[PDB]
């Protein structure tokens, strides 16, 4: 500002990024080489700092990579690294190459996600199984698995311990008439040899995220107990015993239909994502994409629903088309009716070509009630966002009565006094509630009965109440998302 | 005493347009025996032939005769400031207006002012036991 | 020759309840589709009755091209049908009843839905299948709502003389 070129006006810029009103927290494992301190929340800048700050090929880095690629700008990211358990075992996979390449050709593989795909050319004809397996020199460094390149067989070992390394299904082109000049006489076999053993169970959420507000929690793990702890923490943020911080969490569950349905703990604070047993993409990558997309990078408007092929398109994920739907339609309906989220391809094909997934229903895991009755009050995720928005907005509006003289037991206000009474206060609140129809509420069934204001003197018995304390009781309803109109066709062959 | 037709409290809140100043909800008193008059339906019907009608936009109007407060400039009471008014009758009815504007002011002697206000809508709070929603 | 000179035949036609009904806690609904008819020695065949009724279902249950918004749509679900660029009657296929948005009180939204329904089924008169169509919609409560669609047909052979309008072409389906 203050400069040599004096002129009527001075200017003063400070920095580029300004959208700090939206926050997202990503939690996951790390490796040994990571320099970040464990169990300490730290802000995350662009992708340049990654790898070094969280290790090479660690679960956390992969999750963060998708988060940044989905939300280019408009949200602020945070990371909460965690370390492996004391005695965690690392999963091991085997991929044996057999036969001698007797023709010139190329070999290409797809594992985990499209970013890790490779394509190398067979050196020449008559290359044995040992000169082959050069794939190891081609696998990208970011792959969470380490290739050893043994004599004739390549071994993949998870870089992180625990059960998180028990998900894979490879797609290759080394057989059939798919002659991308395929090397004739080569074959590949896939098999597992050792599973993961032990997961961590952190329970110090009250100390590391204490009294700090976050919008969306993302958890890159599949341990049921770990997820349960996150749900309990979120409840505390929505509790009535202290000022609320609000928030929402995203988790995933994988397995057969019988297994997935068994995780329905009836939590309105979580949005469980259901995946089949043969998902061709690493699970947590899809979960991170869904969380980031709904992590206010699009949901600055609480009313918005993250559904459909237009708004709920997880573009960053690319996966080859499967030979079978995976989730049979008779099973898709059951999952939706039970409060789960189901995703599927956004384009039509069965060729094994590349597509992207999208989300059918944006629904939480809410069922029944505290009194055990069934209802859909918190069915849609937008209800949770709208409820939080109403709470904040309502508190701001009522702020104008702070420090204002209030008259009771004699409602006539002298001339020149600045004050108000119960009836005037109630009337003003009604005005605010009505004006918001179409923005935060739908038309009230009976606006004269869903709002009540009573002074504390009328609640407590004689000589027990306090002067200048009111109780406000309000009931509302979010907007209406559609209705059914049964039709009755009639051709009326006769005339008149 | 619910059958008495009269006004109980009048609260106004000015907002100077050229300086953004805001004055708390001061109370007022009326100058004579007249009462305010109201119109809360923002549509006007014109009589066609054979029972038909025509609708016109129109506005929601208010008429508030009140004694000037000796601590507020006379200009504010005329069309040089926003107004937010509330009137509470004896029976219990409360009617609120927000973002109103004064129209076609007339000369005043310094004590009696008869403001004419217009707003998008007026909210009415009937006493307990209403029928309509 | 024999008086049955009209040689025009009739192809397959979609039918209501072809694949049965899908039941749910909210209610029971039809599942339209093609119908299979069986002979005494196998030799299955498709049904072709109620041509106009089948044609009406196709109009209602198909999304038409979506209006431009200024933000855009993904190429997958822009709506419409790629086969409409060859037809010459200067019309686009599908219906837009599903594109309504919650506006004002529920009464206004329902009224808008009726407007779209008429504007879509109006194409039936243009093709000449039916001589008139009208939809009556009633609102009776928060959750219960009904709508009835009335279509007017004609007989195959003309019988009346001195019609104010015109005999609809493509009337060989007699409906």
- Closest among B92, B75, B72 to B12, alpha carbons compared: B72
Cβ distance C105 to A443 less than 8 Å, yes or no, reads yes
Q: Which of A493, A494, A496 to mutate against chain C (most C CBs within 10 Å)?
A: A493
Burial class (CB in 10 A: 0-12, 13-18, 19+), A376: exposed
User: In angstroms, rounded to a whole number, what is the distance separating the alpha carbons of residues B64 and B84?
Assistant: 12
- Closest among A372, A367, A381, A374 to A261, alpha carbons compared: A367
- Name, in order, each residue with C-beta under 8 angstroms of A294's C-beta and a sequence gap of 6 or more: A216, A250, A306, A362, A381
Task: Compute the half-sphere exposure of residue A437: CA atoms within 13 Å on the CB side of its CA.
Answer: 13
| Residues of chain C with C-beta less than 8 angstroms from the C-beta of A484 | 26-27, 145
A431 touches chain B (CB under 8 A): yes
Q: Are A365 and A339 in contact (CB under 8 A)?
A: yes
User: In angstroms, rounded to a whole number, what is the distance separating the alpha carbons of residues B37 and B5?
Assistant: 13
Cβ distance B86 to A447 less than 8 Å, yes or no, reads no
Evaluate whether chains B and A are touching (3 or more beta carbon pairs less than 8 Å apart). Answer: yes
Write the DSSP symbol of residue C68: P
Q: How far is C171 from chain A (nearest CA, A)?
A: 12
User: In angstroms, rounded to a whole number, what is the distance separating the alpha carbons of residues A393 and A143?
Assistant: 46
User: In angstroms, rounded to a whole number, what is the distance separating the alpha carbons of residues A218 and A342?
Assistant: 18
Task: Compute the half-sphere exposure of residue B90: CA atoms within 13 Å on the CB side of its CA.
Answer: 8
Neighbors of chain A by Cβ distance (3+ pairs < 8 Å): B, C
Closest partner CB to A417 (pick from B27, B71, B96)? B27
Cβ distance A413 to B9 less than 8 Å, yes or no, reads yes
Q: Which of A428, A433, A444, A454 to mutate against chain B (most B CBs within 10 Å)?
A: A428
Q: Token pair for residue A264?
A: 């329905």
User: In angstroms, rounded to a whole number, what is the distance separating the alpha carbons of residues A161 and A140?
Assistant: 20
Cβ distance B86 to A427 less than 8 Å, yes or no, reads yes
CB atoms within 10 A of CB A326: 16
- Closest among A31, A28, A26, A68 to A48, alpha carbons compared: A68
User: In angstroms, rounded to a whole number, what is the distance separating the alpha carbons of residues A354 and A422?
Assistant: 64
Enclosing H/E stretch for C88? none
Q: How far is C97 from chain A (nearest CA, A)?
A: 11
- Closest among B68, B122, B78 to B103, alpha carbons compared: B78
Q: Token pair for residue A332?
A: 């898709």
Closest partner CB to C153 (pick from A347, A487, A491)? A491
| Residues of chain C with C-beta less than 8 angstroms from the C-beta of A479 | 102
User: In angstroms, rounded to a whole number, what is the distance separating the alpha carbons of residues C116 and C95?
Assistant: 8
- Closest among A200, A366, A345 to A280, alpha carbons compared: A345
Instruction: Give the residue on C whose Cα is nearest the Cα of A315.
Output: C74
Q: Token pair for residue C136?
A: 């009556």
A231 touches chain B (CB under 8 A): no
Q: Token pair for residue A228?
A: 């349960």
User: In angstroms, rounded to a whole number, what is the distance separating the alpha carbons of residues A272 and A224?
Assistant: 11
Write the DSSP symbol of residue C65: P
Q: Are A69 and A100 in contact (CB under 8 A)?
A: no
Q: Token pair for residue C76?
A: 């997958």
């Amino acid at each position: 500002a203050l400069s040599d070129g004096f002129v009527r006006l001075c200017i003063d810029p400070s920095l580029n990024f300004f959208g700090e009103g939206c926050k997202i927290l990503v939690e996951g494992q790390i490796t040994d080489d990571a320099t970040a301190a464990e169990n300490v929340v730290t802000c995350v800048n662009s992708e340049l700092d990654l790898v070094e700050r969280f290790g090479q090929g660690s679960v956390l880095t992969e999750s963060l990579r998708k988060v940044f690629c989905m939300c280019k700008s408009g949200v602020s990211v945070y990371a909460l690294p965690r370390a492996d358990a004391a005695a965690a075992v690392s999963a091991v996979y085997t991929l044996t190459v057999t036969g001698t390449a007797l023709t010139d050709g190329r070999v290409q593989l797809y594992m985990g996600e499209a970013e890790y795909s490779l394509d190398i050319g067979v050196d020449e004809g008559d290359t044995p199984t040992q000169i082959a397996a050069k794939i190891v020199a081609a696998i990208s460094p970011d792959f969470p698995y380490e290739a050893t390149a043994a004599a004739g067989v390549i071994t993949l070992t998870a870089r992180n311990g625990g059960t998180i390394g028990n998900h894979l299904s490879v797609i290759y082109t080394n057989l059939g008439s798919c002659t991308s000049v395929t090397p004739e006489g080569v074959t590949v076999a896939f098999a597992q040899t050792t599973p993961g053993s032990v997961n961590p169970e952190p329970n110090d959420y009250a100390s590391v995220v204490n009294e700090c507000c976050f919008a969306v929690y993302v958890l890159s793990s599949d341990d049921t107990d770990w997820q349960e702890n996150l749900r309990d923490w979120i409840r505390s943020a929505w509790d009535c015993s202290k000022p609320q911080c609000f928030g929402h969490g995203y988790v995933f569950n994988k397995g057969t239909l019988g297994q997935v349905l068994a995780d329905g703990d009836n939590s309105a604070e979580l949005s469980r994502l259901a995946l089949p047993t043969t998902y061709p993409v690493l699970p947590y990558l899809t979960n991170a994409a869904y969380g980031a997309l709904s992590a206010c990078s699009t949901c600055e408007n609480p009313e918005l629903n993250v559904q459909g092929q237009t708004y709920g398109l997880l573009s960053c994920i690319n996966m080859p088309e499967s030979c079978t739907p995976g989730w049979e339609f008779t099973e898709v309906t059951q999952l939706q009716n039970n409060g789960f989220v189901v995703s599927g391809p956004a384009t039509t094909s069965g060729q094994g070509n590349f597509t992207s997934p999208y989300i059918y229903n944006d629904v939480t895991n809410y069922l029944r009630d505290e009194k055990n009755r069934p209802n859909a009050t918190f069915r849609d995720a937008s209800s949770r966002r709208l409820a939080a928005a109403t709470g904040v907005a309502l508190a701001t509006f009522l702020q104008q009565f702070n420090g204002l003289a209030v008259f009771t037991k004699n409602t006539n206000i002298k001339t020149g006094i600045i004050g108000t009474n119960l009836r005037l206060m109630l009337g003003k609140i009604r005005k605010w509630a009505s004006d918001n129809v179409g923005v935060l509420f739908s038309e009230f069934d009976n606006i004269n009965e869903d709002i009540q204001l009573v002074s504390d003197f009328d609640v407590q018995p004689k000589c027990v109440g306090q002067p200048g304390v009111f109780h406000l009781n309000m009931r509302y309803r979010p907007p209406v998302r559609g209705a059914r109109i049964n039709v009755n066709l009639v051709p009326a062959l006769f005339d008149n | 005493c619910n059958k008495q037709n009269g006004v109980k409290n009048i609260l106004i809140t000015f907002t100077h347009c050229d300086t953004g100043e805001v004055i708390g909800p001061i109370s007022h008193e009326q100058p004579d025996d007249t009462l305010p008059t109201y119109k809360t339906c923002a549509w006007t019907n014109t009589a066609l032939t054979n029972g038909a009608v025509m609708r016109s936009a129109s506005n929601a109007t208010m008429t508030l005769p009140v004694v000037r407060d000796p601590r507020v400039p006379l200009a504010w009471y005329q069309g040089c400031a926003q107004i937010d008014a509330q009137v509470e009758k004896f029976d219990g009815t409360v009617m609120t207006l927000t973002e109103g504007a004064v129209t076609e002011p007339e000369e005043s002697d310094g004590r009696a002012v008869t403001m004419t206000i217009i707003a998008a809508e007026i909210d009415e709070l009937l006493p307990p036991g209403s029928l309509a929603a | 020759n024999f008086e049955t000179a009209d040689r025009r035949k009739r192809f397959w036609t979609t039918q209501v309840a072809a694949c049965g009904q899908s039941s749910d806690d909210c209610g029971d609904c039809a599942r339209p589709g093609l119908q299979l008819l069986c002979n005494g020695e196998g030799r299955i065949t498709i049904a072709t009755d109620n041509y106009v009724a089948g044609l009406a279902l196709n109009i209602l249950l198909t999304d038409a091209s979506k209006a431009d918004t200024g933000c855009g749509w993904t190429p997958g679900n822009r709506g419409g049908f790629w086969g409409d660029s060859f037809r010459s009657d200067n019309m686009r296929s599908g219906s837009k009843i599903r594109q309504v948005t919650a506006r004002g009180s529920m009464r206004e939204t329902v009224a808008l839905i009726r407007a779209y329904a008429i504007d879509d089924l109006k194409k039936l008169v243009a093709y000449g299948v039916a001589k008139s169509v009208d939809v009556d919609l009633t609102y009776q409560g928060s959750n219960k709502i009904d709508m009835t669609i009335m279509i007017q047909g004609v007989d195959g052979n003309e019988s009346r003389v001195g019609l104010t309008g015109e005999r609809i072409a493509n009337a060989w389906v007699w409906s």
